[PDB]
Design a protein around this nucleic acid. Structure first.
Lengths: 127, 98, 150, 100, 113
RNA sequence: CGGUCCGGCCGGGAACUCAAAGGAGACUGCCAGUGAUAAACUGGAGGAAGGUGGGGAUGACGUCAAGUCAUCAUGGCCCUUACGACCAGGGCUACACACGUGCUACAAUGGCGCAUACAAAGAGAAGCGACCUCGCGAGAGCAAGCGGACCUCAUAAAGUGCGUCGUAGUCCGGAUUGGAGUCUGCAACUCGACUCCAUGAAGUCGGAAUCGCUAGUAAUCGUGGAUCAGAAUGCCACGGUG
């Protein structure tokens, strides 16, 4: 049976497809070390996935568009959570209790002009 | 090979104008295409606020232009020839090109 | 005049879910770069295992407990000239100060490799000599004299 | 005002477009030679470079409504002060002041 | 092996005692060493027989050290006598590099301290 | 899913980013605790998430014996054998003395050299200028695409990596003084850019004393545009790390 999920974070958007029976992980038609190999924290995508274990009884296919290597990881983790909550009704309770369903939606601040440093004001004291 | 553009500075005025091209294109015809809303193009400008001082913060402006291509499926004489010779399209700009 | 602001939990580590390590990288972060801290993380504990490192169950959490801040103060006033008072710090502050005390003690003089300068300090964190202890006792000799009139 | 600053403009930017906006080829001919270490041109450079009342240099556009050399905006034909004046009166299309 | 100076640190790098000689430094020294195949990679001090006397003649194709160090201090000598800015400021102690004297001109009075 | 300059490239799909109009959602509304069985807060619950939702445009009166006639008018004073205007040069880059703001190195947890990942947002038909070059290189030479979701500015830099350098107060920092140049303009003395080969210096985050921010904020490194003979450390947006 084909299980599916989507997610967004920090100027990225992801798609996740899961099928029962032994397979692998694929991201943008390559492995999780061919462009992701530079960074040190991509295993946040595995946080909801340990509840079915790392690809020993299922096959995982990922697509992601835009954003940096911490934004893409939060969007892929959201997509995995959105798929695994359909994979078992007992996980539909657990993934809500673990809070992985929660979205992080800020990235910037607004003006509110002027300020040369946008938020910091120039030195008041001295003389 | 005759093509159209519809230009505006208001995102509802352009849709109200799109619907009257979608009317014109099916007033004698039967074939129509979906009008694409397209990414809005913007231009920004920063200037001194007033004819006296205010020398710690400049005043900021941003312009936003809405553009639609519409696509006419059958641009027949009894659909477009009177419109190419007169618009007759207020609050917007209609540009017809060959 | 009341700060007390918001609530900020921060995130745990991506490899073992640690709350202390994910905070310790925010002490070794300089110029907004965490990569330079990840060259010092685990390598200091693995370099301690070249000299004295026995048991790793808590990694460095007990070195941060053998390091013991006690001499924190605040200023009390009713006008111009102020009066110093000592403060009993919470475990969350005691830990946050111990994390700076040890990495500032490892930075005291210029040498090679911060993982190795810190392993030398962690091998000392079973007996605690000189750095992070000799200034403490020289100001603790006022710790009751600064309680006398409250 | 000082109307002599417009009297410069009339014989500079308003007369340069047909004679000075392309002219560097008219001096490059003195660098056109058949061989190295050989001359055919001598001092005729000082006749090809003889104009002084007109130049590619010294050209200021100025604000077309205030004669002001600083704070002009080519896209509107107005200055920093008149952009607000036309916008507050609503006399300039496509431009608004607040609220995005 | 050497072609210049009097002594070199053994195999650490071949550019020492050939760098900083005027007209040749941290660029031309490697291009001169490459005339005998001498490289930055797998460094050695041994140079086979018949290979030194033509390389030691490459460093002799122009002037070296003190006789070429004259020229960097000769434009301040080639004009002094005329009452213009360049002449006067090369027979009196005055600034010549477009720096603001308003302000900070006290550094011409001395150390500082 | 069919064919393939093997290219989302072409058919084609409409799922999925996205670009975008329209509905749903949040009212202190529910419950506890305090407290005029008050009003209102604090806590809990739901959900992607509240508690001026997070944020913009925000400016009630009256303002200091306050600034601006150099944005524009205008009462008065005064000049016109000029406090004009048309030119050639100067001054605005005098320092005899009095105060500040930046930015870069002061390092090692770093630099230097040489490869490599990611954009975001503008600007572009006498313009942005690819490709390939001639040469040590600035530059010069030829010339396509492009009216810009269809080309160009433009291999983003931090970061990821491999060699290499090391406490010597730095053969680091490369200012500065020369040599060889390349261009712009009537013309580069002072007081113009940009390039190649030499040159060689101060400097261990500081002394009385003192700043800004509670979050994409403080901290830190790149991108773009307007102004445009040749040249901003000037003035404003955009993004990574955080």
């Amino acid at each position: 049976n084909q299980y599916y999920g989507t997610g967004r974070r920090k100027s990225s958007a992801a798609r996740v497809f899961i099928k029962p029976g032994n397979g692998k992980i694929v991201i943008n038609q390559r492995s999780l070390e061919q462009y992701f190999g530079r960074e040190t924290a991509r295993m946040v995508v595995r946080q909801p996935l340990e509840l079915v274990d790392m690809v020993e009884k299922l096959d995982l296919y990922i697509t992601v568009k835009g954003g940096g290597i911490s934004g893409q990881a939060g969007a892929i983790r959201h997509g995995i959570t959105r798929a695994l909550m359909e994979y078992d009704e007992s996980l539909r309770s657990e993934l809500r209790k673990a809070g992985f369903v929660t979205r992080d939606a800020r990235q910037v601040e607004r003006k509110k002009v002027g300020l040369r440093k946008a938020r910091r004001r120039p030195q008041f004291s001295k003389r | 090979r005759i093509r159209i553009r519809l230009k505006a500075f208001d995102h509802r005025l352009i849709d109200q104008a799109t619907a009257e091209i979608v009317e014109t294109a099916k007033r004698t015809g039967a074939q129509v295409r979906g009008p694409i809303p397209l990414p809005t193009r913007k231009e920004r400008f920063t200037v001194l606020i007033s004819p006296h001082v205010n020398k710690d913060a400049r005043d900021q402006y941003e312009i936003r232009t809405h553009l639609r291509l519409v696509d006419i499926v059958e641009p027949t004489e009894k659909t477009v020839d009177a419109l190419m010779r007169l618009d007759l399209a207020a609050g917007v700009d209609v540009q017809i090109s060959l | 005049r009341r700060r007390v602001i918001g609530q900020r939990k921060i995130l745990p580590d991506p490899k073992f879910g640690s709350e202390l390590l994910a905070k310790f990288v925010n002490i070794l972060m300089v110029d907004g770069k965490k990569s330079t801290a990840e060259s010092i993380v685990y390598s200091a504990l693995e370099t301690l295992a070249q000299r004295s490192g026995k048991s790793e169950l808590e990694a460095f959490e007990v070195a941060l407990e053998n390091v013991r801040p006690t001499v924190e103060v605040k200023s009390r006033r009713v006008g111009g000239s102020t009066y110093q008072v000592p403060v009993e710090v919470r475990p969350v502050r005691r830990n946050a100060l111990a994390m700076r005390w040890i990495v500032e003690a490892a930075r005291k003089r210029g040498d090679k490799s911060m993982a190795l300068r810190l392993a030398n300090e962690l091998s000392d964190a079973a007996e605690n000599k000189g750095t992070a202890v000799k200034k403490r006792e020289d100001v603790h000799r006022m710790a009751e004299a600064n309680k006398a009139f409250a | 005002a000082k109307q002599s600053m417009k009297a410069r403009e009339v014989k500079r930017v308003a007369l340069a477009d047909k004679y000075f906006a392309k002219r560097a080829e008219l001096k490059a001919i003195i660098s056109d030679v058949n061989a190295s270490d050989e001359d055919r041109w001598n001092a005729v450079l000082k006749l090809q470079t003889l104009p002084r009342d007109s130049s590619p240099s010294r050209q200021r556009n100025r604000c077309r409504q205030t004669g002001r050399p600083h704070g002009f905006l080519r896209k509107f034909g107005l200055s920093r002060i008149k952009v607000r004046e036309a916008a507050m009166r609503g006399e300039i299309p496509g431009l608004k002041k607040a609220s995005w | 092996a050497r072609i210049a100076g009097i002594n070199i640190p053994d195999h650490k790098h071949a550019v020492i005692a050939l760098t900083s000689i005027y007209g040749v430094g941290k660029t031309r020294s490697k291009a001169i060493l490459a005339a005998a195949g001498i490289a930055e990679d797998v460094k050695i001090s041994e140079l086979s027989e018949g290979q030194i006397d033509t390389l030691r003649d490459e460093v002799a194709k122009f002037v070296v050290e003190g006789d070429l160090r004259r020229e960097i201090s000769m434009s301040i000598k080639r004009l002094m006598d005329l009452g213009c800015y360049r002449g006067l400021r090369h027979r009196r102690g005055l600034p010549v590099r477009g720096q603001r004297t308003k302000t900070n001109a006290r550094t011409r009075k001395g150390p500082r301290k």
